Amino acid sequence: LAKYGLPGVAQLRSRESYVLSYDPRTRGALWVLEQLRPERLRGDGDRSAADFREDDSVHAYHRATNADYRGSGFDRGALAAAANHRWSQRAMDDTFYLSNVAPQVPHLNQNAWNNLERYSRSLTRTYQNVYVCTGPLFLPRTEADGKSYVKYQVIGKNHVAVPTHFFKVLILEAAGGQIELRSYVMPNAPVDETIPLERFLVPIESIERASGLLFVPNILARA
């Protein structure tokens, strides 16, 4: 049966600063996983951000390019954020692979998603370890005919999918081995950043039901 190979299997990529799984249909990451180091800012300022680079490990049929973003009116939103990974130049450089990138409404990337990333880093003062899983959603909506539809834009030659929403799952270890899960969803839209961040909390089941994903699966019974 499988004598002519399998047409598609899971595309994990490990980089210096994150691991991701890649969806070649949407030309985007399914999820991106990272740890946030405490702050320390003093060995590891000082960092010289890179150009964005398409990912040669992805087949060119299925690979976002800088031309796909240029003139789209979306920014290149890095899912594993570059400011999480100033602890190493290679660590920071790897966040500028476009496989780490989704089309993001610039106001979201600039203001309220930025605030979410800075709050996530701040929890390293408070917890034994902080891990973060970031990814896209494509959430359906009801229309006038009573039916539900997924509708998302695609941009560029390569039809790079524009997510309707983004999730960020904070995986927070407090000191007992105890894992706390904090789950945020924002729309791919202008979002007022003075709205407190707890208003974008959603139950983790919601993200898991909609995204296809099952987070922290080694945790057989959650707290």
CA distance 45 to 173: 26
Write the secondary structure of 204-221 as one string of H (helix), E (strand) and C (coil): HHHHHHHHCCCCCCCCCC
What are 171's strand-pairing partners?
A: 131, 181
Answer yes or no: are the C-beta atoms of 200 and 170 closer than 8 Å.
no
Structure tokens at 45: 């300022």
- Select 43 or 77, whichever has its Cβ closest to Mg ion: 77
- The least CB distance from residue 143 to its own copies, in Å, is 9
Residues that bind its own copies (CB under 8 A): 1-10, 12, 18-19, 21, 23-26, 30-31, 33-35, 59, 61-62, 131, 133, 135, 138, 140, 147-155, 159, 161, 171, 179, 205, 208-219, 221-222
If contact means CB under 5 to 8 A according to the sort of partner, which of its own copies, Mg ion, none does residue 59 touch? Answer: its own copies
Least distance in Å: CB of 6 to Mg ion?
22
Structure tokens at 20: 């991701």
Min dist CB 193 to its own copies, Å, is 26
Amino acid at 42: R
In the 8-state DSSP scheme, what is residue 30?
A: E
On the CB side of 56, how many CA atoms lie within 13 Å of its CA? Answer: 1
Q: Specify the residue, 49 or 174, whose C-beta has the smaller distance to Mg ion.
A: 49
Entry field: residues in the chain: 223
Q: Which does 126 bind (CB under 5 to 8 A by kind): Mg ion, its own copies, none?
A: none
Nearest residue relative to Mg ion (C-beta): 77
Answer with the entry of Mg ion, its own copies, none that 56 interacts with (C-beta below 5 to 8 A by kind).
none
- Radius of gyration of the CA atoms of the chain, in A: 18
Q: Which of residues 67-96 bind Mg ion (CB under 5 A)?
A: 77-78
- The listed partner (Mg ion, its own copies, none) that binds 175, CB under 5 to 8 Å by sort, is none
Residue ranges that bind Mg ion, judged by CB under 5 A: 77-78, 109
